[PDB]
Amino acid sequence: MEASCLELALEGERLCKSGDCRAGVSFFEAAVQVGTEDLKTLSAIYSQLGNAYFYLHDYAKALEYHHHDLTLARTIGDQLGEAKASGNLGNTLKVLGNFDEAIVCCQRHLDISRELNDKVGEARALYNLGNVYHAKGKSFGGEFPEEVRDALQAAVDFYEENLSLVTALGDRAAQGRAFGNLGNTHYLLGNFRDAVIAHEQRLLIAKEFGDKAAERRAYSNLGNAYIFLGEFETASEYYKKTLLLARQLKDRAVEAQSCYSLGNTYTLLQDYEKAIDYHLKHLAIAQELNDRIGEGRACWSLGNAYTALGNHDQAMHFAEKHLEISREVGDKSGELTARLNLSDLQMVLGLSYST
Template identity: 30%
Template sequence: MQRTKLSLLKARVAVKQLTGSYDEAREDSERIRELAQQIGDQQEVAHALVDMGNTFKSKGNLQTALELYELALGIWREIGDRGGEGKSLYSIGVVHFNRDEYELSLRYCDEAMKIQREIGDRVGEAFTLSNIGTVHCSRGDYEQGLRHYEETLRIFRQIGDKRGEAGALNNIGAVHYFRGDYEQALVHCEKALELHRAIGDRANEAGTSTNLGAVQYFRGNYDEALRYYDTALRIQRQIGDRHGVAGSLNNIGKVHHDLGEYDGSLRYYHQSLEIYREIGDRVGEAGTLGNIARVHYERGDLDPALRYSQLSLKIEREIGNRLGEADALCCIAAIHTCRADYRAA
């Protein structure tokens, strides 16, 4: 009976994580951990800790995610589960990447990949290679990033993992995008989109549509960008991905902002802000508050611009996002300068 309940809860966690219902996913993961502890299944306890870590990571709470992954790592090592150990090392590496701790991220990913190669975990190896590629790209080393993504793509094709193949194509497209090679970015992302549609992967279809929208946005093709963003938004609403919906609303708001359609931009930003607050995504909330502030600033509405900038600054400081904090401070300084309040600026 307990095993059946565990299986049902695990399936529900997977669905909740996919749809962005992170609080519900965390609650179910906590129930799984309690059940697993009751029946003495340390492996399931560790799996639950990893799932809980994933939900905290998705909401931007990286410190708690790291602590949970480290607890899971200790259990995997204690029971001698090399696969689980590799999985946790990879997860820890991802957290360090998200904290801009690139050397630590590479160190943990290298440890993970060594284990994954020893035990023949090709899927795990591919994901770890992908994260290593992302670290290199974030440091501006696109050649190294591209090399790791192409190796990832080769593995996924060898093992016939269409979902992984599509993800790798997406990442390769992203490298070309950041290098300004928009044609190659479109080619790879469109291939990824075809695969997502072929296998019925609606969530990643939405994600790739978002990437294609971003490429068109930076090419100045706003109609095409809106078409892709609208596609992503429609899918995300259909599958109940509230986090994705918030992001797409934000993207659509940015297009309207750039077009000078301030009322439309604010309408989309406020819808996005409401969702970010409901799901507890403080990173998204802070960024959206900053976007709203910039619209008001450009309209000359300095009082609301200052109010939203200060709200954004407060959250950026609370979550430790130094780059976001700097952006908010720059906006506040610009507002005070417009008011000729040079001392406050």
């Protein structure tokens, strides 16, 4: 009783739904080998193979199977099927850096959705187009390239359209994703205030769902945007909130990054004592996760903070640690600067005594 295409297919489907796409792929592959005349099911097989490989990060294969799905959906005249495949093929092409074709695929998805009067599908396409342009914008390279700017502005436009429709459909969670990406795009463009405004909404919505991760993301984005608005005190308030959330979600890495941002922010506010505190908390966690590179960044920062406080002795110590870490990780610029900091501090000390 050799298994039928449909049976293998259903196994691959539940396998992928359980997180094990590596196995599901196997069954889907087998089902294709067995074959079927039900092209609608074969279409679903390809689509799921493409999506599974995408998840496995085998984009070349995700491309192959989404390409197949799109072709078949078109051959058998499945409109909704073509729209979905166009969107999937577009996200894949995006990852692969083929933005021109990704845009075409996602625009195709948009068109078919509007024709079928598929409002949620329309929303999904606008969001995909927004994501594609966002990626395009980041795929370039003190002049800000106009090509980066046009792409990012294109993203803002699609995100706003998606946002508009998605709030009209009452999809609160989708509004949240729209706000967050809209905020990050503005951040990269340099529209800090609008970034802040969009992120506040992302924060607002994350709280409604009790989505702690989303909430943490919003606090970090807010802090970063305020830094570039020159509003450091406001930035610190948000970095503290990310720290608490991070501390609460038991994320050591993120908690360390938060302490490091706080150290820098307080240095900008010229409160070196607090900078020291936060940089120390970051130092510890860095050592704990055995992150030498970040430990170097820590010693570098501590040395500067202590130097700014007049604490010569403590500055020496960290400059030494910095020089050490820098050489161990093979960082040239750091080695030299740590070196220059050491000899300078030694000069400051030795010259502080009469001839």
